[PDB]
């Protein structure tokens, strides 16, 4: 939902008080991507165990 997926496309593009909004979206999305990865691998470690 942000303007661009790259940080430098926002850090070197938008002002600080506006860049904080878009960067907060990518950090929100990329963090849930890890929780889905770690959760899956943490289940596969049980099937292999």
């Amino acid at each position: 939902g942000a303007i661009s997926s790259v940080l430098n496309d926002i850090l070197s593009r938008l002002d600080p008080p506006e860049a904080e909004v878009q960067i907060d979206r990518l950090i929100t999305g990329r963090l849930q991507s890890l929780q889905t990865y770690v959760t899956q691998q943490l289940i596969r470690a049980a099937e292999i165990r």
Binding site: I3, S12, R13, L14, D15
Partner: protein, 48 residues
Amino acid sequence: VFNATRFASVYAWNRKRISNCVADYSVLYNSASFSTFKCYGVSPTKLN
């Protein structure tokens, strides 16, 4: 673009293309040649 002798109309507006050149956006920020200056998708200080 900005120091034009005559501007276009909104019923049918012209479009001046600018490409392959060294730009200097100091006219939009520092020089007193405008009443207001607001950017939407970019910072006004990083244009240069």
